Design a protein around this ligand. Sequence first.
Ligand code: FBP
Ligand code: OXL
Ligand code: OXL
Ligand code: OXL
Ligand code: OXL
Ligand code: MG
Ligand code: MG
Ligand code: MG
Ligand code: MG
Ligand code: MG
Ligand code: MG
Ligand code: MG
Ligand code: MG
Ligand code: MG
Lengths: 483, 489, 481, 509
Amino acid sequence: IQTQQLHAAMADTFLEHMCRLDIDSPPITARNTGIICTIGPASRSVETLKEMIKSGMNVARLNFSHGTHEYHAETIKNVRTATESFASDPILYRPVAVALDTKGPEIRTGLIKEVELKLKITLDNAYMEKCDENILWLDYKNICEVGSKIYVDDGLINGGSLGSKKGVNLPDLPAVSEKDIQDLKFGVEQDVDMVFASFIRKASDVHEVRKVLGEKGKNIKIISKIENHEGVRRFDEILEASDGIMVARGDLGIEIPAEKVFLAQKMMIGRCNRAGKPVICATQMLESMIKKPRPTRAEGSDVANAVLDGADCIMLSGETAKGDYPLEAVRMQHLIAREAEAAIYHLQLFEELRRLAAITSDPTEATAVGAVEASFKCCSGAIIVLTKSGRSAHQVARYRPRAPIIAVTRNPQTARQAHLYRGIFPVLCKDPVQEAWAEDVDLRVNFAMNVGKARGFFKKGDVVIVLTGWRPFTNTMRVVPVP
Amino acid sequence: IQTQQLHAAMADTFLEHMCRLDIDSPPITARNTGIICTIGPASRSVETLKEMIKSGMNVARLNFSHGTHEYHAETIKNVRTATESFASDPILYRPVAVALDTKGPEIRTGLIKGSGTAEVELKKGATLKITLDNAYMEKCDENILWLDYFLVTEVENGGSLGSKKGVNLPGAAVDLPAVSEKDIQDLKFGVEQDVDMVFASFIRKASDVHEVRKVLGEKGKNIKIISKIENHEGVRRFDEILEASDGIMVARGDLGIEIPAEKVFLAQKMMIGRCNRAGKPVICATQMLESMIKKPRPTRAEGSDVANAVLDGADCIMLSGETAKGDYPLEAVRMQHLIAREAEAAIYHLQLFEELRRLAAITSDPTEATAVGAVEASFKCCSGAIIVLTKSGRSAHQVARYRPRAPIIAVTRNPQTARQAHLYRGIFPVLCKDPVQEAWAEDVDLRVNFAMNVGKARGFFKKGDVVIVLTGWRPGSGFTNTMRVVPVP
Amino acid sequence: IQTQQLHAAMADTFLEHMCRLDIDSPPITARNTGIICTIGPASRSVETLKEMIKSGMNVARLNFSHGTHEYHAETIKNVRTATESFASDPILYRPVAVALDTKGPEIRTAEVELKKGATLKITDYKNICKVVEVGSKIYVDDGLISLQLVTEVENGGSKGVNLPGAAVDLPAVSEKDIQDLKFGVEQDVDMVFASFIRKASDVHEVRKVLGEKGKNIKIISKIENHEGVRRFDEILEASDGIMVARGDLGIEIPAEKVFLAQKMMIGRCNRAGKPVICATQMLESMIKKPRPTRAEGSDVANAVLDGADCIMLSGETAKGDYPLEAVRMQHLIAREAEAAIYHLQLFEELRRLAAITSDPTEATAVGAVEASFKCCSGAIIVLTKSGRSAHQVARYRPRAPIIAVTRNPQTARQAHLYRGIFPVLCKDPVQEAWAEDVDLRVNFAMNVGKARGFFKKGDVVIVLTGWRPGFTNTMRVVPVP
Amino acid sequence: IQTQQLHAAMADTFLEHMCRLDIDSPPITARNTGIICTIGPASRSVETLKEMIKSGMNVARLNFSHGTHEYHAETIKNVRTATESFASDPILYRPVAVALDTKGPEIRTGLIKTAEVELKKGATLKITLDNAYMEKCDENILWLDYKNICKVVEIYVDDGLISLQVKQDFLVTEVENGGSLGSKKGVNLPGAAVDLPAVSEKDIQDLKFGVEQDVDMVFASFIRKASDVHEVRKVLGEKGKNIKIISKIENHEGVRRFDEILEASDGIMVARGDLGIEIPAEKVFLAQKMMIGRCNRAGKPVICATQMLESMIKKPRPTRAEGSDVANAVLDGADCIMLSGETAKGDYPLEAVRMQHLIAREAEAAIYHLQLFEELRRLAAITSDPTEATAVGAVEASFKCCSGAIIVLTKSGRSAHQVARYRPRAPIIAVTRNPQTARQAHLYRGIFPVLCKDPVQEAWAEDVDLRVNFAMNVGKARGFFKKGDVVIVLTGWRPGSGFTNTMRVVPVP
Ligand SMILES: O=P(O)(O)OC[C@H]1O[C@](O)(COP(=O)(O)O)[C@@H](O)[C@@H]1O
Ligand SMILES: O=C([O-])C(=O)[O-]
Ligand SMILES: O=C([O-])C(=O)[O-]
Ligand SMILES: O=C([O-])C(=O)[O-]
Ligand SMILES: O=C([O-])C(=O)[O-]
Ligand SMILES: [Mg+2]
Ligand SMILES: [Mg+2]
Ligand SMILES: [Mg+2]
Ligand SMILES: [Mg+2]
Ligand SMILES: [Mg+2]
Ligand SMILES: [Mg+2]
Ligand SMILES: [Mg+2]
Ligand SMILES: [Mg+2]
Ligand SMILES: [Mg+2]
């Protein structure tokens, strides 16, 4: 009571659960929702990236709609330089994933040399870098009603600021282009952790991305970005082929009526939760913070409601890439997400996730849901999960516990990819593998304990749930008290 | 199926309800959420007000934080002039409420260069002198700014500085009066102008609500008092404030500065839930479509904000600068209309009705049992409307508290009742002007047929559809005891 | 809250609902579960039948497995003589239905002593060897003797025959079934209990016998064997109602499984809104004792909690020594169990399982039931000609009694099949003014309810009528005058 | 879906759950509801008791309302002789508990002269307190043993078969119901405030005798208040501090004071016989469902007793009402069901035990576990006790994989008790080296106790595995599960009680 919105947590109805929400009930220290940040001129710097990690960044998203492979290579180097500067203290080290966002079948403008419009759309490539208030270039070859309205820069253009390489939307380009082929091949070379595939329209599109990543990138998680009507209508087949989903609201809000976007968002988040696959809510969550240090009330509400919807990650696309207040934007998402995680009606969520879950003979699945139930019974400070591939941690997150899921791994890629799942706080263990299997299992558990104690996830008198295996397929649950 | 998100309506779980939301499931024609629009330079004209009414406006909010009584009088005149221009056709006539928003215990600025519409661009790091000398009351600019509560400050972030703007001192315990002398005058002016409701700013306690009611006196005893919760004290004392008030406004603008911005959604959802639980109107207000002040399309967060407020259970949604001073007031009104309809169809009515009854007390009031019976019957047959004859509005309010999917066509001869009905989700008020028939049954039928004709013309239903009709057995207020499931004639 | 277990009614969980059941919370006067009594030598007299009506009897069951048409004709005469002796006072008159229980496709055989392990050679069912295989079981005399045609005595001892699991091909209607059924049409019975219904085609054959003259006679299919349970859905769709004939069912299927079939059929009938009867041995010990056993009290109560519209008495009233007490016991327990129903969950699930239809009568009925819960109504008064409007209300299982007012005597008698319908037969002439005819019939329900103690002046009741001088679509929440 | 009523288990509503119950859906082999049998002339023999164990008996109930200490001692000897004759095979051995049922504050009549008299309806009977007629009870005069009788009355004899209506050191009544009046029959004064002691001198004598004979539990008759339970515990003292005290709720006061009685007791018995005389018979089902619900809510054992299969005293098959009564008691949530005359004096004791076993198994599959487990959690308190979190986590896991068993290592039984309170579908195989723990476990729904007799292994971890494999072998032999199935295994991290914190989801070896 008076903490973690626990009074609201015990209500017999969702209506009373709302009525008991208390701004004076402080949340726990731990924050479950992963934060993805688009890197750009305002945040490419190593000094900024270090502070962005401390502010809550978990995934660095690189939009390959602009920039050369050389440019992104230096960005990744800076990201990894900032990340590895905390490796001197493995208790406080934070794994940071690198995400590749494809250009996709996008129609883009050219370079300004931005300008304020209060316009001849050329297709001659001599203006492919000479665009401005009067000139503007376009890249769609198979282009040609008289053509009434053309939406530029996420439908912004009415006058405004027209930047370089802005987007154009027409509510037959290939799913993956050769330029796309290159970027993922480059992403495989740079050992990125995940791929954000733009404008995925069908399941065949997802299979093409996987073939390109091939055996070399077989562990690269493919997150399909639903940005248009076709993606929504074929969502089920896209989700089955993908490792996760991004609700790309920017383009989606242009391709489909703006008043329907919340329907598509809640549909995809629900189905991803139902499938136990990660879902990302993206774009314009804190749009005004590009120029202002404080978000609007609608922006604060959007982030909170995305977490309440069940989103695994929330994104900043330009608030961190080019805005004037990148650190504040990340901190705001951290603050809002933590408050919203406490406001989740876990009583109903856990019940429906279980009732919608299949009866299986898999010991790990039964063990994971048992750990989540136990963590509710004792209001656990954490669920510690030992995992090599991440699956054990993913299975716990799918049942959406209140307590944070501390995944201990020796696999760095597994550690970085874990950010895709709500509640997984990955820790990279660096102690040598013990020759005795039980002692190596135990060794990683004490590692998770020390991180949780140091970060303030739990204290003396709390209780934690520990998930391990029994043979050299995690099937062992231990309820141990925190010293 | 395939319509009004009815596939999502039949889900056994809220998770499956989310999974079944369909962007290709078109909503019904009727829109249940009331729309309140702040009137200002962008919307004072009769021509604009005419288009704002057609675009979906139900309540006109006049902020007395700025402007003279003379100025506001012409605003009310224009609102009523635009409203009465549709009175030549009572089938499509739309009652429009007038709302008075008090200044309250506000720290406000003054006129930029002697003009309310004038603005200045402040730059980061600039120096600004805050003055209390009334020689700058009407002469504020990028260098000097007068206030009604001198200080040399810097600009931690610049922007457009307009006239009669707000100032906030978080974390403190201000000593400004709940009702000021200026508030008393504005409140008396509102009683004289026959406004329908008062939005009382910065209500911190129940004593505040009672003082506003005393000023409204006997002449304004029927003026609805909506307490604006804008600060820490208002949230902590919400139950006693709600008990004293006729309704509640989540005034997120000031609330988002007074309390941490990341906590505002908690206070919003708490208050909407408690008003829903109490059956009193609740308004979600401010910055819902802020970007539409300068842009013709809202941001994705703003579209989400309106939808979720409706899903939260808000009776009304508000527009401030988007309609008072923005460049796209009609589009902002139309955007709220479009989103509200979509979100109204996405409500999980199965669970909502379920909790509303269980949280409702067993009463011997025949009107209450009749209202909840009408809502159940409207769910059973997916009725096109619940027609309610009401004199004071009470009968219609009791139906709205149980949140039916179908629109509530409240028929009244009382114009003030017609205007105030906009405060409740789903009440579509129609002002009947026909003479009272001496035979009660024929007077009842006359008003029922009036709602029928409105519903047909509006595309709510057609002949052969099924509607729920709530009437009384004796003329007057308090005898609503008859529920009929009738085919449209 | 101290009455009708209303404290238990407000529990948020069924477990807490159980925890709040209070032996000191008295039930209401009205009793909702219909009571069906088999009439026989112990209850045939006019004087006894009068006391049985006063004690709660709603339906008189005549088992045509025994007795001649002459005998049953005199039984019906006595039932109607006792019933009609209260007709001089329509406030205290109780419509009493007459039910014909068919012999059906029955297999029949001093005494002889059978020994365990001995062999028996079977030599009136001429087609048994084609429906039983080597190793099949045969049960004789209410399951007393069991055999395994060269049979082996599995259970010995010193009549009716059951072939469990076996697909018996005997005709649905026998020649004497046709004659008995035709006799029932001649005697103007209200309902038929069709024994050993195995498939939907069986129900259609019974309906064929009743013809146009008995087109309004309700057919209650008796589920008595494995095939009937396995084909229940098609049987229920074809029938007007269902009887859980536990006597024979307990022989045809393992006795430990009978409760599964009972709760299955009651649930499915509740889901369809069709009457269901729980029958046989409910108070069996009261044949010889004036008080029931604890198991028998529990059986009656749990049948009501299951959702059965009626409970039945067989030997307890046909041949036992305490028929009045057996009827009174069922009346008392049913009332206690009706107050112990978790109406919060029941009403919730009945609506969710109900289809969204554009039928005004359906919307009116569920709206009336919802309103009756909101104001703790003393009754739901329904004016009805066919009973349909009253049946639609009963399917949503309100706590309050449903006073169905009708001028149709058959409608009044058949209404007893539905939980909660208290039928009253209005006999006043139709008034030329429509509204005065409605008011006359509503005030009749008013006076009946007041006299029976269902409510008093100033209480609140729900009234269901029509709006123009042909379908019930008007609900009024009125104080009792 | 075709077994254990699993289709009905997945219904979104209890109504649909009813609609999906399938007589062709066979239950699992395991039977969770404990069976208590009253021992008497029909069942005292070692040979009969042997068959009673094989037919399903878990608890032998000895009614000390009759019989000498010598008599009951020989019954206990036969029970243990019959029980230990299966110890030659520890895989199939079944621990059998011995339960002492007290006489309590009982009012009994005098002696007639198998002599009995026929009381006739409408006739008159005089109640006398004069000890001269203590062995001269006839059709007109009847003696009893209650000192302050005529004061607390302004009457029911022989289990309520005979009912009297008083008309006046004496009393004049009129026979409301006739029947046969034997010697030392029982008398009920419904509602009247009886001042008889909770524990009598005879009760103290029997209770001390039970400690000497090492009984596992006491069925305390006519518990009216918590002070009564406390008096029973005082008599049992430190020597019998581990004897479970089961309070029998048989009267109005016990129901009204149930919460305080339940708090003081180890369990509760719904003694429907006397309760059905003390309160109106039509209300007994209310008191049954209240007490079972509250015992389920408190996590303490509850027994449904008396007349469950009454007709089987003379008949080899039960009535349809009796079969329903057994099933519905299990559906209510009763941990154990009881037989009284059906096994003590009836002609078909074996069949009565077999029928209860059969019905209970069928009813256990028909429980709506979705709603039951859900409410048990919501009504359960958030605690920092690791054993509590481990228990509810294991049960949740057991539903997820439809486990063949939940194997629990326990010395005192507590770990196994905490699992049973959440009512899993799967049986709880409690492995113990404590024979008293094995016998007392029968009080809890679903706990199948197995008494391990292997020597303690020198390596503690190997001793744990030995006991887990023992449970595996028991489950294999009883047909609870087979190789390749999945079971939940509950153990501790340290030796000794109170360290059960480890849940393993393992395939059967
Ligand atoms: O239920 P109880 O009495 O707490 O017994 C459980 C104990 O059994 C064990 O699982 C092992 O048994 P032992 O203590 O006999 O070695 C302990 O770890 C555990 O604490
Ligand atoms: O590409 C995106 O992220 C979008 O359109 O939102
Ligand atoms: O007054 C208001 O609307 C606010 O402060 O948001
Ligand atoms: O025929 C019957 O009623 C039976 O078998 O129960
Ligand atoms: O004593 C008993 O067991 C009873 O009364 O049932
Ligand atoms: Mg995009
Ligand atoms: Mg204001
Ligand atoms: Mg304000
Ligand atoms: Mg028959
Ligand atoms: Mg007839
Ligand atoms: Mg039969
Ligand atoms: Mg005893
Ligand atoms: Mg007692
Ligand atoms: Mg007793």
